[PDB]
Amino acid sequence: VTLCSPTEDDWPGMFLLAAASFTDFIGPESATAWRTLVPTDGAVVVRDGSEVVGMALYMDLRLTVPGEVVLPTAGLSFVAVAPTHRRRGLLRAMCAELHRRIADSGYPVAALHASEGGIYGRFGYGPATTLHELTVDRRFARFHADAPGGGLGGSSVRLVRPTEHRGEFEAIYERWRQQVPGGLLRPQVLWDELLAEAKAAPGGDRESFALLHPDGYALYRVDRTDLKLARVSELRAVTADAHCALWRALIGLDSMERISIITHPQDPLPHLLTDTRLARTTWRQDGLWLRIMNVPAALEARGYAHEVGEFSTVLEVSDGGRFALKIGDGRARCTPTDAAAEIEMDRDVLGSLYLGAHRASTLAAANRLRTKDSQLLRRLDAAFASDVPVQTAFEF
């Protein structure tokens, strides 16, 4: 059992383990586009001896955090242990090696999407965004008198074929991802993949359509089996007017009974309707997970709420150092100290706080973060909150 960077000869073994590990992995073409995002030395394999029994890699990503700050982010992905090689510490060894490489390379944060909720906490990843599925019974849906874009005259939204408006989607998405925490830069090869998945598949997905506004788009397709359900795969709106105009058009899908979308907890959709209850939360799950690799670089990088007055404390991350933390004027200074800790928490908890998806007070009530100062808790809650609600870009 060796742990090595893979050679070109290892990749067929890795595509076999992939196919057996992930139902979405069709074959080598499934990996081509993503693989252009893996740097030299971004991948590890474990061999028996030899055949591939374990793999893991990271991609070079750009993640938007509160204050519209973009961090270089190591996106862990393609993580698999062969079913023959369970309980042999292979995931732990692979994560320790990648984390060493990611830290040495200078990434301040790593990120991933978890197959299960019980695995990545112990490696310092905290769930940092929240997926919220809304299902609308569009047969009852009526827009509130207050809702934008109710006026008579032309619609600002067009029904279009996705493959014919690639440039407009790219430009809108680029504007979205720079202004929203959770945003990820989407490279050309991932737009190539997305537009390929928009075609009908022989005995697979139905053809995708787009609704296009100058300041937003929605991609949606009818469900393969439930012919009265339209699933929105992605809606990116840069203005409230674009968000409301796109939902007016989706609620105009008169063939459908239901429209579903995977959105975020602060989606204003329910408030656009005379009956807020028509936007039913049908599913909720962790989205992006974060591991803070360098505590001071990450805490100094993001912006903080201007509404909380200057305060200083001492934060200890369980295996991640102790820091004098001063937050004022929406910025934070985070320097080494041996002064007594006022706040303690494991690394994973800091990742859960980092984009504003989880309140310090909520984590404190579970004893995940400990302090004897309730004023300090209120100040942390306020300071770490994000003005712009955190959203989930695309899984990887």
Ligand X SMILES: Clc1cccc(COc2ccccc2CNCc2ccncc2)c1
Q: Which residues belong to the annotated binding site for acetyl-CoA?
A: 79-81, 87-92, 115-116
Which residue lies nearest ligand X, judged by its C-beta? 24
Query: CB under 5 to 8 A by kind: which of ligand X, a copy of itself, none does 382 bind?
Result: a copy of itself
Residue 354 makes contact with ligand X by CB under 6 A: no
Distance between CA atoms of residues 244 and 215, nearest Å: 11
169 counts as binding ligand X under rule CB under 6 A: no
Helices (H), 22-89: 29-35
Which CB sits closer to a copy of itself, 65 or 308? 308
Q: Is 333 left (phi over 0), alpha (psi -120 to 50) or beta?
A: beta
Is 254 an interacting residue with respect to a copy of itself (CB under 8 A)? yes
The answer to whether 233 contacts a copy of itself (rule: CB under 8 A) is no
Q: Using the minimum distance from each CB to ligand X, give the nearer residue, 31 or 240.
A: 31
With binding defined as CB under 6 A, does residue 56 bind ligand X? no
Q: Which residues contact 372 (CB under 8 A, 6 or more apart)?
A: 342
Residues 16-55 that bind ligand X (CB under 6 A): 22, 24-25, 30-31, 34-35, 38
Active site residues: 120, 396
d(CA 61, CA 395): 12
- Residue of 61, 76, 78, 308 that binds ligand X (CB under 6 A): 78
Residues 6+ apart with CB under 8 A from 293: 74, 99, 102, 103, 107, 108, 109, 110
The residue among 57 and 390 lying less far from ligand X, judged by its C-beta, is 57
Residue 204, contacted partner among ligand X, a copy of itself, none, CB below 5-8 A by kind: a copy of itself
We find the least distance from the C-beta atom of residue 337 to ligand X, in angstroms, to be 39
Instruction: CB nearer to a copy of itself: give 52 or 102.
Output: 52
Q: Is 336 exposed, middle or buried (0-12, 13-18, 19+ CB in 10 A)?
A: exposed
Number of residues that bind a copy of itself (CB under 8 A): 97
Annotated binding site: 79-81, 87-92, 115-116
CA distance 268 to 276: 10
How many CB atoms lie under 10 A from the CB of residue 26? 11
Alpha carbons 325 and 379: distance in angstroms, whole number: 12
- 20 near a copy of itself (CB under 8 A): yes
**CA gap 201, 304 in Å, rounded:** 46
User: Per-residue b/e over 119-133, b at no fewer than 16 CB within 10 Å?
Assistant: ebbebbbbbbbbbbe
Choosing among ligand X, a copy of itself, none, which partner's interface includes residue 175 (Cβ < 5 to 8 Å by kind)?
none
- Please identify, using beta-carbon distances, which residue of 77 and 260 lies nearer to ligand X: 77
**β-strands 109-113, 288-292: how paired?**
antiparallel
Q: Centre a 10 Å sphere on the Cβ of residue 100 and count the other Cβ atoms it contains.
A: 10
Candidates 33-41, 99-107, 202-210, 294-302 — which segment interacts with a copy of itself by CB under 8 A?
202-210
Interface pick for a copy of itself out of 95, 278, 299, 343 (rule CB under 8 A) = 278
| Residue in 29, 139, 331, 339 binding a copy of itself, rule: CB under 8 A | 139
77 binds ligand X (CB under 6 A): yes
Encoded amino acid at 66, one letter: P
Cβ(4)–Cβ(45) under 8 Å?
yes
Instruction: Kindly state the tokens that stand for 88.
Output: 């042999």
58 in contact with ligand X (CB under 6 A) = no
Which helix H or strand E contains 349, and what residues bound it?
helix 347-354
Q: Which residues bind ligand X (CB under 6 A)?
A: 22, 24-25, 30-31, 34-35, 38, 57, 59, 77-78, 395-396
